[PDB]
Design a protein around this ligand. Structure first.
Ligand SMILES: [K+]
Length: 108
RNA sequence: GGUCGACAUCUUCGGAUGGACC
RNA sequence: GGUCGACAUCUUCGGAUGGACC
């Protein structure tokens, strides 16, 4: 619904280079960039659908995006286990963000 | 009138902070 | 009370913009 995954991102590529390429789609998203791959969560599922049709290359019928002059394939169908692990990853990060301020109050 | 390539608004990355907004 | 890893403050090198401040 809200997720796509960019793979085969060239080595040494900074996160900003990845984020910039996705910004060209004109939709708001969060980005996690690990191990030459990047997960992308759009704000709503509808804009993800519209993002897919922009990445879709009708010549080879596959989703692609250019990064540093190279062609990177994107996945629209995430394996169930990978997505499940991913939402838990977020939940921890979000709760970690809120735990920070809570503990700061305790320091008083 | 004086000051300003050393002034402001917005803003990418990076760094340092804690609470921020409604 | 609600929303914030998608909230903000400060800051180095930059970008855009025009006036900014006394
Ligand atoms: K993400």
């Amino acid at each position: 619904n809200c997720l796509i995954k960019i793979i085969n991102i060239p080595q040494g590529t900074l996160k900003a280079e990845v984020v910039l390429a996705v910004r060209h789609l004109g939709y708001e998203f969060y980005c996690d960039y690990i191990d030459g791959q990047a997960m992308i969560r759009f704000q709503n599922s509808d804009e993800q659908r519209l993002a897919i049709q922009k990445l879709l290359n009708h010549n080879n019928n596959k989703l692609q995006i250019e990064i540093r002059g190279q062609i990177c394939d994107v996945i629209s169908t995430i394996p169930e286990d990978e997505e499940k692990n991913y939402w838990n990853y977020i939940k921890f990060k979000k709760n970690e963000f809120r735990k920070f301020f809570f503990m700061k109050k305790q320091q008083k």
